[PDB]
């Protein structure tokens, strides 16, 4: 029920996924708690990708081994073990950058986003054409 363009990369080593929208990494703390960090020395933006079904991924901190995932009001937090919850399609977006939207939540494209401020977007609030949804994976220094 979406489009299956996706992005060339790979998932043998792990990245920093890059917001463009006010430049934070994804960051998942050790207490549960996601958001972005512009800091990149931080020790929990590191996180592992890795392809589950085709087009799907589960996104873990390679640090604490916590997953990514968004919760039944949109939120997104740190889960402990995988689950539903963490599962989420990786897409290519304006021929270029990486979106990834909740496996769980997909028919109301709830998307994976970072404000300016450097918080993470409820689900409900994002939506295609945001620059808070694009993302760009880099190498770990």
């Not at 901190?61 to 995988?82: N, V």
């Not at 986003?113 to 450097?118: E, H, Q, R, S, V």
């Amino acid at each position: 029920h979406h489009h299956f363009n996706l992005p060339p990369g790979n998932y043998k080593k792990p990245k920093l996924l890059y917001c463009s929208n006010g430049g934070h990494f994804l960051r998942i703390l050790p207490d549960g708690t996601v958001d972005g960090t512009r800091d990149r020395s931080d020790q929990h933006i590191q996180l592992q990708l890795s392809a589950e079904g085709g087009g799907e991924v589960y996104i873990k901190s390679t640090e604490t081994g916590q997953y990514l995932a968004m919760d039944t009001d949109g939120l997104l937090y740190g889960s402990q073990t995988p689950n539903e919850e963490c599962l989420f399609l990786e897409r290519l977006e304006e021929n270029h950058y990486n979106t990834y939207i909740s496996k769980k939540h997909a028919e109301k494209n709830w998307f994976v986003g970072l404000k300016k401020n450097g918080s993470c977007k409820r689900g409900p609030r994002t939506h295609y054409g945001q620059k808070a949804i694009l993302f760009l994976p880099l190498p770990v220094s």
